[PDB]
Design a protein around this ligand. Structure first.
Ligand code: NA
Ligand code: NA
Ligand code: NA
Ligand code: NA
Ligand code: NA
Ligand code: NA
Ligand code: NA
Ligand code: NA
Ligand code: NA
Ligand code: NA
Ligand code: NA
Ligand code: NA
Ligand code: NA
Ligand code: NA
Ligand code: NA
Ligand code: NA
Ligand code: NA
Ligand code: ZN
Ligand code: ZN
Ligand code: ZN
Ligand code: ZN
Ligand code: ZN
Ligand code: ZN
Ligand code: ZN
Ligand code: ZN
Ligand code: ZN
Ligand code: ZN
Ligand code: ZN
Ligand code: ZN
Ligand code: ZN
Ligand code: ZN
Ligand code: ZN
Ligand code: ZN
Ligand code: ZN
Ligand code: ZN
Ligand code: ZN
Ligand code: ZN
Ligand code: ZN
Ligand code: ZN
Ligand code: ZN
Ligand code: ZN
Ligand code: ZN
Ligand code: ZN
Ligand code: ZN
Ligand code: ZN
Ligand code: ZN
Ligand code: ZN
Ligand code: ZN
Ligand code: ZN
Ligand code: ZN
Ligand code: ZN
Ligand code: ZN
Ligand code: ZN
Ligand code: ZN
Ligand code: ZN
Ligand code: ZN
Ligand code: ZN
Ligand code: ZN
Ligand code: ZN
Ligand code: ZN
Ligand code: ZN
Ligand code: ZN
Ligand code: ZN
Ligand code: ZN
Ligand code: ZN
Ligand code: ZN
Ligand code: ZN
Ligand code: ZN
Ligand code: ZN
Ligand code: ZN
Ligand code: ZN
Ligand code: ZN
Ligand code: ZN
Ligand code: ZN
Ligand code: ZN
Ligand code: ZN
Lengths: 172, 172, 172, 172, 172, 172
């Protein structure tokens, strides 16, 4: 038992480790998407930049969770980071939709974590989640939804012109 | 077949994918070490900072390999990132020794890759490896060896005072 | 025999002269393309600027090869610079494709030169080629492939709007 | 027929294409001279610099003629650029004399072009030639004559000391 | 055996020690030449400055080789530095010619070292040699050849005026 | 006989040449010590820096003696620079003690030189020695004695911690 541990439940520790793995997996997926868009037969540099930035932010979130785990006296237990489902994301619109799905999954996991923390009467963990993850996920989901809506209205994925102009004007 | 592909062998493509996975694994290991040293019962902030920086550099090396793969017309195929062997690295000296072992393994993989590229007559890949990875690995191995030697002479791992002073003076 | 000549094979000298002629020819071709796009019935000023810049860079590469030839004690022997195959390049997409073909030809010639230098045990010439030409050619080929992919996706050469928007947004 | 073409005779268009080829040939000759003086057994860096600058200026003149051809609605038709007559220019004095001869040839071609433009009643072409080429050629011929006179008085080509001091003091 | 040693052959270690001795010897020779030209009956301050600078650069190269030897886990074994062949270098032209001969000898030794490293499959050592020594030797040999050519053309060693003017204008 | 020579004895000339050789030998020894401390199994960067600086200062003293020899009309006669006695200096304390011994030897040689100059009635040489070498040697010997005393009191060579802390605090 850690000397700093106080009001930190074992269930909360396990949930934090699971969330760490999920954030690392999201970072891996975003990296895969970015370098799909760096391909010579896709060539959407601003899509690639956007997804690389998302990957870096995801890794930062994982590091913040690890820092919280060390702060509360828990012990980090790392697991394998599974590879992304696809190697070819087939379009900017499809990548945006998959990113929206992934962010909604991450948000649902965070909501389950907050529910568990509320059940265990861990106000510090609850406020940590609320302050650092919930609103960030809400804004990320809203932004991805806006991007998907705009791409659909311009006519993606059939319109390479639509994807090109979105890359230049919205992501540039 | 990619429109930009020229003098790029399938064996080289597969070896580059393997090296990408190895660099990502090294990044994961360094992250594990850093947050082991962030623990309340270890509390070596400069060890943690050093290993976090190593993890970021490993990320950058993996991303550079992915960029090279896209440049040469190859296709990136990501695999699972295996978890690190240990959760508890037991000391600064032990972590330094394991990092030295890992860097020597990475250097050996890079040397095998250079040998394969020389066999396949890929001077661009050979020069890429020589310019961006071989000397960096040599300096990293030399630095880790220096750190291990200094820790042993000061009397680690038995001397918490030795580890504390090394953290303050060499890593600070 | 030059007083500075050392480990410089006659085959290498002849290959360097051939490469000088090839670089000058590439410069001529790029100049032709640029002033095709300066025509009143084409009027793509950013295409013209891009190809003029490529012509200048090709000239610089030829001058660097001549400097290397003088450095190693060889003697420069200039030949006729053949005219470009076409006077009318018919579209931005067609010009981009022909430029990609030309850069791949130049890269293949450079790879043959590196193979000859390796056979003749000329590490200085090998490293000169690797440092100054191979990665530049790889990046140029990747960039041209990206441009061709983007033009095709926007719908060139049928879409004058696609060529106009590419000229403004990617080349501007 | 171009939509911008007005008072531009076919004879003038052909003469402009011929002048473009002549300017490119002069650039090639000056490049040859510069890298002759870059040789280890000649080693006159300021002669080499002077002739390289002349080559760049000749290329600029050719590009200006191509721009004029596009402005007047003519069509550029590029020809082979013949190699220079000599590979070895034998001295600074001999190179200066050959450059003077070449500039006089270029000036005579420009005067014939101006005569043709006057015959065809093309005041725009006449004024273009007068503004951009005739006085530049006159000044270049005067400068080359001054250089030749000075080299002869100092005692070139017999006096390597004369050529060295001219390189340092006049061309430096 | 050093803890950092990897893919470093004993033959390569011995060759590196030999090259260290050769670079130190070259530094000694250049120092001798510089202070020959500092003599009251020679009095060529810019020749002395040039050769002193060459001596400093030679020692820097020796130190870089020693650093490489420590980096790769080899052990430096220093030998006697033999005295230069002559105490009186008899002229600026003769000193320049002897320096050219010495640089060609050093370049040949470096080429033999690169051949040995290629045979032992040591890409790091090969790239180290290519990056830090081969092109420097090529430029140094070219510069010395240019100096010798210029001195001969001005009429050295018979012309003390030629040596004086070369000292002032080329080396000043 | 030199035109500038005045009141300069042949014995003084020979003694100056001997002192030049001694200073060069001291520079060589200090270089050996510095790169011993650059080894991966020693790893004392500040010891290495200190001894490299001492080697450079020894270079400068040798060059100043050569300058004096040229000033007084003497002729420099260079000899072989013998290798240092040891390749392994075994500790910071042992290296400091050997450096103290070497500086005392150099000081004794300088005192013998001053005695000879006084005997030959060479006040310029006497004052040159007094101004540029005697007080520097006294200060260097005092500094080395202080370093040896401090290392012994901290407990070197048994205490790698003592050597590490001395490297950080006194030499850093
Ligand atoms: Na994937
Ligand atoms: Na979802
Ligand atoms: Na782990
Ligand atoms: Na290893
Ligand atoms: Na190994
Ligand atoms: Na053409
Ligand atoms: Na091609
Ligand atoms: Na090819
Ligand atoms: Na590129
Ligand atoms: Na020629
Ligand atoms: Na003429
Ligand atoms: Na005439
Ligand atoms: Na000598
Ligand atoms: Na030689
Ligand atoms: Na030694
Ligand atoms: Na002594
Ligand atoms: Na004594
Ligand atoms: Zn749980
Ligand atoms: Zn690609
Ligand atoms: Zn983009
Ligand atoms: Zn990040
Ligand atoms: Zn977050
Ligand atoms: Zn913390
Ligand atoms: Zn746990
Ligand atoms: Zn998986
Ligand atoms: Zn994949
Ligand atoms: Zn709250
Ligand atoms: Zn637009
Ligand atoms: Zn393979
Ligand atoms: Zn903790
Ligand atoms: Zn700390
Ligand atoms: Zn990173
Ligand atoms: Zn790229
Ligand atoms: Zn693949
Ligand atoms: Zn695993
Ligand atoms: Zn773990
Ligand atoms: Zn790297
Ligand atoms: Zn050939
Ligand atoms: Zn036009
Ligand atoms: Zn434009
Ligand atoms: Zn150019
Ligand atoms: Zn190039
Ligand atoms: Zn050069
Ligand atoms: Zn030739
Ligand atoms: Zn032709
Ligand atoms: Zn044409
Ligand atoms: Zn290389
Ligand atoms: Zn005509
Ligand atoms: Zn040459
Ligand atoms: Zn010059
Ligand atoms: Zn130009
Ligand atoms: Zn002009
Ligand atoms: Zn125009
Ligand atoms: Zn025409
Ligand atoms: Zn011809
Ligand atoms: Zn020629
Ligand atoms: Zn050997
Ligand atoms: Zn003198
Ligand atoms: Zn001088
Ligand atoms: Zn130096
Ligand atoms: Zn060097
Ligand atoms: Zn080092
Ligand atoms: Zn050894
Ligand atoms: Zn000797
Ligand atoms: Zn001597
Ligand atoms: Zn004596
Ligand atoms: Zn070592
Ligand atoms: Zn240190
Ligand atoms: Zn010095
Ligand atoms: Zn000194
Ligand atoms: Zn001194
Ligand atoms: Zn003096
Ligand atoms: Zn003497
Ligand atoms: Zn000896
Ligand atoms: Zn030794
Ligand atoms: Zn006094």
């Amino acid at each position: 038992t850690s000397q700093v541990r106080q009001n930190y439940h074992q269930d909360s520790e396990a949930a934090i480790n699971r969330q760490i793995n999920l954030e690392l997996y999201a970072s891996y997926v975003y990296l895969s998407m970015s370098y799909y868009f760096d391909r010579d037969d896709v060539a959407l540099k601003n899509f690639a930049k956007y997804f690389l930035h998302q990957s870096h932010e995801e890794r930062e979130h994982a590091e913040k969770l690890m820092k919280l785990q060390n702060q509360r006296g828990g012990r980090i237990f790392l697991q394998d980071i599974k590879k992304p489902d696809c190697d070819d994301w087939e379009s900017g619109l499809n990548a945006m939709e998959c990113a929206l799905h992934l962010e909604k999954n991450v948000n649902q996991s965070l909501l389950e974590l907050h529910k568990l923390a509320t059940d265990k009467n861990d106000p510090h963990l609850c406020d940590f989640i609320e302050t650092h993850y919930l609103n960030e996920q809400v804004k990320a989901i809203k932004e991805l939804g806006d991007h998907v809506t705009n791409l659909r209205k311009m006519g993606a994925p059939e319109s390479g012109l639509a994807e090109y102009l979105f890359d230049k004007h919205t992501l540039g």
